[PDB]
Design a protein around this nucleic acid. Sequence first.
RNA 1: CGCUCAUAGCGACGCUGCUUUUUGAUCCUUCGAUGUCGGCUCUUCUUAUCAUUGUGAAGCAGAAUUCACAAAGUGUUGGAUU
RNA 2: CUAUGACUCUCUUAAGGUAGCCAAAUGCCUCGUCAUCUAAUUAGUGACGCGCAUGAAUGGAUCAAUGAGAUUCCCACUGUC
RNA 3: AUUAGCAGUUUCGGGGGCGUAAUGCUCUCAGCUGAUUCUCAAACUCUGAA
Lengths: 51, 217, 250, 50
Amino acid sequence: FEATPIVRVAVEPKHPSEMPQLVKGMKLLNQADPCVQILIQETGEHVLVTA
Amino acid sequence: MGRRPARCYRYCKNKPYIKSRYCRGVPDAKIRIFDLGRKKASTDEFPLCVHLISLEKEQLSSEAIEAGRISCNKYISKTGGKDSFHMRVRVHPWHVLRINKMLSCAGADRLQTGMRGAFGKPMGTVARVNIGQIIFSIRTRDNMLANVVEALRRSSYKFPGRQKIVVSKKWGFTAYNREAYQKLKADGRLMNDGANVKVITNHGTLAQYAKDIAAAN
Amino acid sequence: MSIFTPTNQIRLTNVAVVRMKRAGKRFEIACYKNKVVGWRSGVEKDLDEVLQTHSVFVNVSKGQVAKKEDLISAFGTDDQTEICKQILTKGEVQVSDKERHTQLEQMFRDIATIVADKCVNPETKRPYTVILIERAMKDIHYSVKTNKSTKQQALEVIKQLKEKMKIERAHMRLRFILPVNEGKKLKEKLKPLIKVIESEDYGQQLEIVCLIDPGCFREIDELIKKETKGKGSLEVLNLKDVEEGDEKFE
Amino acid sequence: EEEYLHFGEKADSENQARKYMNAVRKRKGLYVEEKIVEHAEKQRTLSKNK
RNA sequence: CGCUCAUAGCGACGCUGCUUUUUGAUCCUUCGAUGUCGGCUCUUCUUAUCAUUGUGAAGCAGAAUUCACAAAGUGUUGGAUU
RNA sequence: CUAUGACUCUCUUAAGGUAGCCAAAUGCCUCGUCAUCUAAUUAGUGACGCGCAUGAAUGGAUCAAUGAGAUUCCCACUGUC
RNA sequence: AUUAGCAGUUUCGGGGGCGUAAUGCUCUCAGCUGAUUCUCAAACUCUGAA
């Protein structure tokens, strides 16, 4: 389940060296909390999405 | 001039300079506009005129004048509208102010800051007015008096010193009083001019005349 | 004697000094530090605002006012306002520290921006982000230089960033048309040395090649060609932001 | 701003509506802002009335 | 502007003052010689009051902040660098 | 576009700064930019260098020893607490 | 030096409404002309001061 308006947000690295960690983390989240655009993109490198 | 404080010039002194082939280096006047409201208004509809006068003899800065006009042009709208105010201001700024600059100095001096070659360069355009000389002037309908006096009042704050407000006894931008204005209509001597009245008068500048009554009529 | 009855003093300026050496003669002027920049940024605020004084000096630090002969000779005119204006436009300008910093800041942004134009492409909808690069630059530490151009600086510093590590930029297709005889020769040398794609040798229909560069390394790919065979039949140049047909490289 | 001075609301500008469309383009984005090339420019070389 | 709402708090263009703690302008005083800049020391005074005493406003609920009166009674620091 | 300028045009006067070196006892801006040293450094040192105005016996760069020379930090030092 | 509208023009300037569109009229706005209006111009002054 994604939202009907397709609500997006610009998730960014706080530190540049933490970028990889951030990337990893989204994937991890995906299993626990359902649905994020970490791969297969319509807008940007990665964006968090919800219902 | 907004650089200086205008204390510097609010006393009418020094014989008066001008723009010319002699004073070329002037800035441009602040007010280049003397047109507030409905200029295309007939003389036979706005029978009131109010005036604002400088109580004191003094200079009257261009900037100040400009400021004043938007106490009678914001306040044009909230009260009445464009169909009440007709303003020609009734003073301009021909006179100029010089500035012998010593701003150069902020730590030391070159000595040219001193009074050698003292004479200042043009900087600040300004008006000169006696006590009678009129400074604002709204020709208007006679259902608008307190809603135009308060424009004038507002303006007065933005002039140096003392400023008197008044209402005349005429149809405004005319010599002739309200008593002698009705004559014109009655005697068939009213001649319209979209703003002014020419007022038909018999005279002789010819050889044998009779068109001097039959011209404008 | 000095010690007894005033021991005397020296005095320092706090006004910008715009200087230009014309005909081996230094002319200078009296302006302020945070106006002289603003003039050149298209903030026309009266010339009389930017000038503290309208005169020209041989040295405005001490206060030696400049000479008519010197002026006319060096400018082709003795009128001073115009000369002052010219000086303001042309000559070196002293600035404050804050002002200086602003320029540096701007440069910093610029060098990130130039990197962002063409970035890493998994598809063609990923990074192209200025911010990350900037952050990286900040966190690696390198001297940002006003004498150095922005592009050059970027080129210099991307290498450094590479071994952080962080992969950056994407290549494009600068396309060519070689001759029949020399094209083959070129191919023989350019295949293992650099990346070459869409190669199709023919006897009648010439040879097409596509040398791989980002635009910022187009001297190295062409030099070899020049050495070997000279210029091609046609030489295609594309923009340094996108490759005309969407980037897919790196 | 001349147009605005005639006055019939403020639109096709910075607005209440542009709050929603201010900079939502960039969630990092496809590009820095917008990269596009065109060959519709130059009306004389194309020889068009369109 | 402060959602709204001119003056809670600010305040445009504009206008009037005070101050002598800035720097110029001036050259009256001194070139029969007022020892020039800072720091230490030490008192005194001014208030244009940062704190505290007492008061009143606030977009002052509490918290903290902001604004103002009386008031100069008591405080008003330790260091790097220069 | 290069950092820079080998280069090509051109002018001035014969040439137009090579090796090196550097905010130097030489950098106005200037408390330059970066790193370090310090809780904090207009100071110090090491980097950067279109250098207001470095540079080769007007000697350039290096440097052991030497120094009632000049500066920084640390340790012994605490009434120079 | 410089403010305002007015009128008379438009085979001369421009764009609209009126038969497609104009300068054919009528408009705001250019130019020119006529009568009126604002401030009069130390180096302007028909007049002219003790």
